[PDB]
Amino acid sequence: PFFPPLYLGGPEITTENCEREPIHIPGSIQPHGALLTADGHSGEVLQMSLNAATFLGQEPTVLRGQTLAALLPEQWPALQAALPPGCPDALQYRATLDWPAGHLSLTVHRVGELLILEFEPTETGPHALRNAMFALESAPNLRALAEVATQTVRELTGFDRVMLYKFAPDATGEVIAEARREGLHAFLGHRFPASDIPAQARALYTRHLLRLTADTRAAAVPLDPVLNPQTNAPTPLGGAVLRATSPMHMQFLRNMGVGSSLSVSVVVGGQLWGLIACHHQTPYVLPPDLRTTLEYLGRLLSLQVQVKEAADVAAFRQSLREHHARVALAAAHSLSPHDTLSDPALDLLGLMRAGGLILRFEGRWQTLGEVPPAPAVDALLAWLETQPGALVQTDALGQLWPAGADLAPSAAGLLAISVGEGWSECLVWLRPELRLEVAWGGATPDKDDLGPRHSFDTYLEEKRGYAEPWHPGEIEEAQDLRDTLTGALEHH
Amino acid sequence: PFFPPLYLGGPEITTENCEREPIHIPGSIQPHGALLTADGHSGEVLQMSLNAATFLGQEPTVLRGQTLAALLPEQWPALQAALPPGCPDALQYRATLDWPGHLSLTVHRVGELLILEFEPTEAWDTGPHALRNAMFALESAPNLRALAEVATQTVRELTGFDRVMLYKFAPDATGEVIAEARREGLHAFLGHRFPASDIPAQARALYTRHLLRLTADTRAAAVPLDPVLNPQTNAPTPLGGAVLRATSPMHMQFLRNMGVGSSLSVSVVVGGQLWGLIACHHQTPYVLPPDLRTTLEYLGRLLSLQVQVKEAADVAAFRQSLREHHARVALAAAHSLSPHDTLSDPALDLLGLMRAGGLILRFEGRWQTLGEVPPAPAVDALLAWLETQPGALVQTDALGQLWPAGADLAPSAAGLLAISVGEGWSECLVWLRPELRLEVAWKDDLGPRHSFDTYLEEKRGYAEPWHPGEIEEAQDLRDTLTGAL
Numbered sequence: 001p002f003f004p005p006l007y008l009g010g011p012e013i014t015t016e017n018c019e020r021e022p023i024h025i026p027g028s029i030q031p032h033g034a035l036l037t038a039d040g041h042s043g044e045v046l047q048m049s050l051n052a053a054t055f056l057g058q059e060p061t062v063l064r065g066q067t068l069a070a071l072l073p074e075q076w077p078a079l080q081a082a083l084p085p086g087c088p089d090a091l092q093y094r095a096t097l098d099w100p101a102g103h104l105s106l107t108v109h110r111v112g113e114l115l116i117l118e119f120e121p122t123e124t125g126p127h128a129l130r131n132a133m134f135a136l137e138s139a140p141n142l143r144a145l146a147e148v149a150t151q152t153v154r155e156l157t158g159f160d161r162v163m164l165y166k167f168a169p170d171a172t173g174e175v176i177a178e179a180r181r182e183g184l185h186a187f188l189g190h191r192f193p194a195s196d197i198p199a200q201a202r203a204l205y206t207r208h209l210l211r212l213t214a215d216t217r218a219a220a221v222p223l224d225p226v227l228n229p230q231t232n233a234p235t236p237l238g239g240a241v242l243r244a245t246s247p248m249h250m251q252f253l254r255n256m257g258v259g260s261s262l263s264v265s266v267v268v269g270g271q272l273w274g275l276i277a278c279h280h281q282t283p284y285v286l287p288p289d290l291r292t293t294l295e296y297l298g299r300l301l302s303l304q305v306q307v308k309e310a311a312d313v314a315a316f317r318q319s320l321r322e323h324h325a326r327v328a329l330a331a332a333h334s335l336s337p338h339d340t341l342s343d344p345a346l347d348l349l350g351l352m353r354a355g356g357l358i359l360r361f362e363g364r365w366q367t368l369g370e371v372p373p374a375p376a377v378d379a380l381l382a383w384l385e386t387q388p389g390a391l392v393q394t395d396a397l398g399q400l401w402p403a404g405a406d407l408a409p410s411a412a413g414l415l416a417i418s419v420g421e422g423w424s425e426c427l428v429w430l431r432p433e434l435r436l437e438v439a440w441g442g443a444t445p446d447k448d449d450l451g452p453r454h455s456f457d458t459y460l461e462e463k464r465g466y467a468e469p470w471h472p473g474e475i476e477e478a479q480d481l482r483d484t485l486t487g488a489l490e491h492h
Numbered sequence: 493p494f495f496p497p498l499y500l501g502g503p504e505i506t507t508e509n510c511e512r513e514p515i516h517i518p519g520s521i522q523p524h525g526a527l528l529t530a531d532g533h534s535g536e537v538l539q540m541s542l543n544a545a546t547f548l549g550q551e552p553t554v555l556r557g558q559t560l561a562a563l564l565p566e567q568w569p570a571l572q573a574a575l576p577p578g579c580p581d582a583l584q585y586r587a588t589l590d591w592p593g594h595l596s597l598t599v600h601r602v603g604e605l606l607i608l609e610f611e612p613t614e615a616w617d618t619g620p621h622a623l624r625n626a627m628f629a630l631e632s633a634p635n636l637r638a639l640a641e642v643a644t645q646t647v648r649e650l651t652g653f654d655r656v657m658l659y660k661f662a663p664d665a666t667g668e669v670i671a672e673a674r675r676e677g678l679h680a681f682l683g684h685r686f687p688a689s690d691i692p693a694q695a696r697a698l699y700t701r702h703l704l705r706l707t708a709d710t711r712a713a714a715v716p717l718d719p720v721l722n723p724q725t726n727a728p729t730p731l732g733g734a735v736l737r738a739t740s741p742m743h744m745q746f747l748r749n750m751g752v753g754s755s756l757s758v759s760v761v762v763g764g765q766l767w768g769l770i771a772c773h774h775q776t777p778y779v780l781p782p783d784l785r786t787t788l789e790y791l792g793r794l795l796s797l798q799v800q801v802k803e804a805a806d807v808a809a810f811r812q813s814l815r816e817h818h819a820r821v822a823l824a825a826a827h828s829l830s831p832h833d834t835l836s837d838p839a840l841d842l843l844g845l846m847r848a849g850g851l852i853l854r855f856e857g858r859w860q861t862l863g864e865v866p867p868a869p870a871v872d873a874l875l876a877w878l879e880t881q882p883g884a885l886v887q888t889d890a891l892g893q894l895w896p897a898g899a900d901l902a903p904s905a906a907g908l909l910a911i912s913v914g915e916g917w918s919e920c921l922v923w924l925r926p927e928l929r930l931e932v933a934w935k936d937d938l939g940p941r942h943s944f945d946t947y948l949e950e951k952r953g954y955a956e957p958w959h960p961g962e963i964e965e966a967q968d969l970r971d972t973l974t975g976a977l
């Protein structure tokens with residue numbers, strides 16, 4: 001439930017209520033350009049940023065109450081045809097102007113009744129985009145795609161760091177690829193919690209696929225009037241590039257020594273899959289024509305992420321079928337159940353990429369790899385008889401079974417299947433608690449306050465007693481092997 | 493099973509064996525540019541188009557047996573890094589050169605061999621903002637039709653082609669022109685459908701790998717390679733991934749018979765599947781500049797993503813309509829006065845649920861019709877036949893095939909979708925569709941006029957096919973109306 005903005009007597013945005021900041025209506029822009037609002041039908045100029053006087057080269061009460069028909073004689077008709085009334089706010093029309101001051105870049109979009117116009121100053125790799133397109137397409141897998149992405153974006157822009165975040169099923173982030181300036185601390189591997197990108201921001205980033213912060217310490221430029229004359233309501237700048245960045249996030253960037261930010265959304269199936277995220281250590285305004293190149297990549301990558309990721313998962317379960325069949329080969333020609341499955345040539349640990357494994361057959365049990373102590377295994381198998389059905393699954397049995405909280409370091413994660421119905425005979429794969437070393441290692445990005453160092457520690461805190469989650473393809477192949485090994489007791 | 497090419501004593505490519513033409517190895521290029529092949533490791537020039545002497549500005553035995561290290565001193569290292577040995581043939585590296593004029597080098601690797609394409613260009617750009625605005629337009633279009641309109645309109649505005657169509661391949665591999673933009677005073681192709689034959693499987697498969705090919709002049713002479721065979725292996729040079737590949741002579745005739753001077757087409761690919769083509773025709777010869785073709789390639793991929801999204805969201809809203817309709821039937825079904833009266837009620841419109849021409853309602857030992865249905869005795873034989881079938885549901889685009897005795901009934905009922913209310917076909921609903929018929933989109937030999945007639949011939953006794961969402965909702969309604977007894 002949104003708060004009111006600061007300019008309508010809204011509360012202070014603290015770290016404990018930030019998920020309710022109305023980031024879409026700051027009533028102000030960034031000072032590297034200028035903004036006008038105008039009536040959708042009449043073209044009468046209604047609002048204006050204070051600095052618009054100086055960019056456009058006219059006086060502050062001469063622009064207000066003037067027609068766009070007069071101000072943009074060539075563009076006003078084409079502008080209008082490009083944005084029919086009732087079209088969505090995502091739709092944008094661009095063109096370049098030739099004015100005294102100099103060359104400007106007009107970027108227009110319609111929010112219902114209102115037209116919003118953004119003015120920036122304008123005016124080099126000729127085949128860098130085309131070659132990058134073919135490179136992304138001919139990359140072998142998601143990692144290699146992610147490498148080409150971050151590398152290409154860095155070559156085009158000359159940013160100090162270019163990362164690619166991938167959002168996990170639980171909304172937490174992970175830096176899956178990186179390209180950076182020599183002598184900067186790495187973020188590759190860093191994960192951050194869902195909190196650090198509020199749902200309001202996620203949702204906004206799914207609609208509009210680009211936003212920047214050109215100077216993390218610049219003063220915002222208010223609109224005048226701040227409220228829309230049409231409705232006496234705040235102006236929705238969510239789809240304007242020049243929107244003032246949230247003051248909360250601006251601090252976060254400043255605490256990393258980030259002068260400038262930029263990020264392109266990667267969207268697959270109406271879902272925010274990730275972000276190309278760019279940081280510079282000094283203020284840096286990308287020229288409008290170059291930002292367009294990043295936008296093309298944003299969409300080329302959106303298509304290609306989907307294709308490479310789906311083809312990776314095809315080849316993943318393909319490996320699990322061959323492995324599964326190789327288990328079932330030895331299972332039919334079985335000397336002793338325990339001996340055949342404990343055989344390291346088969347590698348039942350490697351099928352489910354497990355740290356440990358409990359094998360239970362003919363009234364007794366054996367382990368393989370890292371497993372909890374003797375008595376714990378008996379209580380664990382006792383607990384398995386409590387559960388209904390053939391399959392049991394969890395990323396943290398500490399939650400699902402309270403008495404097994406102590407067993408997390410050996411076995412936080414669990415995947416189990418009963419061979420006969422009833423848990424007398426069963427396989428039980430176990431995974432260790434999730435632990436990752438810090439992404440920078442030696443260096444520091446900050447320290448105890450708001451920042452990435454805090455964000456990493458507080459991510460690991462959220463994953464207390466949590467294991468690496470089971471791939472759905474592993475849970476499916478577990479349940480196929482459950483049915484196969486039932487057929488291997490036709491020898492018993 | 494491919495034939496040998498014409499230059500290795502291959503047979504004549506007729507209209508009856510064209511599905512076996514080795515279109516990937518014509519051993520020749522189009523005369524608006526030039527081609528070199530070179531060794532992947534050494535960079536030694538092996539083959540060369542006869543016209544390459546002219547374009548590059550050197551003599552025909554001076555270029556052959558020269559290194560790319562010498563010829564392209566700046567590019568040869570970068571070229572090589574961009575195309576690692578064993579990388580796929582789809583991967584392309586481009587750069588512009590500055591020679592005695594400006595040339596556009598386009599390189600790709602086919603295993604051991606490097607293939608280099610030279611076309612004339614300029615030193616600028618991809619825009620101005622026509623591409624960017626078109627991207628946002630495609631994205632903010634409401635459905636597949638509206639997307640297809642923006643596509644063909646935008647491509648025509650950028651290129652200035654005479655016609656720009658969008659083909660959509662059907663499940664059976666036949667084509668359909670779903671959208672068009674053209675010059676005022678040209679005959680429309682919107683609605684035209686063509687059979688699977690007219691784009692051979694070899695060409696389909698090639699168009700899935702490489703997403704662009706042209707024919708700059710439909711009556712120009714091809715330019716052979718010298719030598720035609722590769723010195724490495726004494727094997728033909730695979731030009732499948734080269735833009736300058738000579739177009740099949742068979743298709744070139746087809747275009748000429750339409751009065752088409754120039755052709756161009758971009759592949760639309762969704763999930764490793766050739767979904768359709770942006771297809772462009774000009775009535776005079778027309779060479780697209782390399783920089784502009786790149787703009788079409790970007791759209792080809794933007795459209796590939798967006799086709800998928802709009803089409804999946806259309807189908808979401810389609811079955812969404814069928815749920816509301818289904819529930820509105822089940823509302824009247826529970827408060828039923830007489831089964832026949834309630835379902836024959838035009839306020840419910842059981843015809844409109846499955847978009848049917850006719851409907852047979854069978855309840856309490858008797859039957860009634862609705863809309864266009866075959867004669868009285870035919871309906872009795874049809875319901876007799878339904879008792880033969882196992883299960884609750886029966887489905888077909890042409891019952892003439894599935895039931896031989898109902899061949900005569902096609903004009904009223906070629907297509908059939910049927911469901912039994914109780915188990916056993918005593919009580920049942922039977923939707924019926926007419927035979928598929930379409931008017932001409934706008935002589936006797938090869939051409940689109942022949943292709944349209946021969947498409948309709950293939951769809952003899954065939955109806956419009958049932959959407960899977962209609963067959964699914966049919967089977968849900970089957971279970972709902974069992975509950976109304």
Ligand SMILES: *C/C=C1/C(=C/c2[nH]c(/C=C3[NH+]=C(/C=C4\NC(=O)C(C=C)=C4C)C(C)=C\3CCC(=O)O)c(CCC(=O)O)c2C)NC(=O)[C@H]1C
Nearest residue numbers: 015018192195196197201245246248249261263277452455
């Ligand atoms: C209490 C609110 C939180 C929050 C506010 C906030 N954050 C954003 C946008 C981003 N926040 C991000 C988080 C990180 N960025 C990083 O680089 C790292 C570590 C390496 C983290 C953890 C990111 C990535 C973004 C996207 C943009 C970018 O990369 O620069 C917003 C939205 C602002 C807007 O759209 O104008 C808001 C309101 N940040 C917090 O830490 C918590 C406190």
Ligand SMILES: *C/C=C1/C(=C/c2[nH]c(/C=C3[NH+]=C(/C=C4\NC(=O)C(C=C)=C4C)C(C)=C\3CCC(=O)O)c(CCC(=O)O)c2C)NC(=O)[C@H]1C
Nearest residue numbers: 510511515686689690695739740742743755757771940943
């Ligand atoms: C059995 C041989 C036939 C055949 C050979 C053939 N055709 C192509 C390429 C295309 N053929 C197309 C068919 C049509 N294009 C149209 O515009 C229309 C009518 C509106 C039809 C029916 C199309 C669309 C293409 C794609 C390229 C383009 O649009 O120009 C090839 C492959 C070309 C190459 O790369 O070498 C071949 C071998 N054409 C026939 O009619 C049958 C007899």
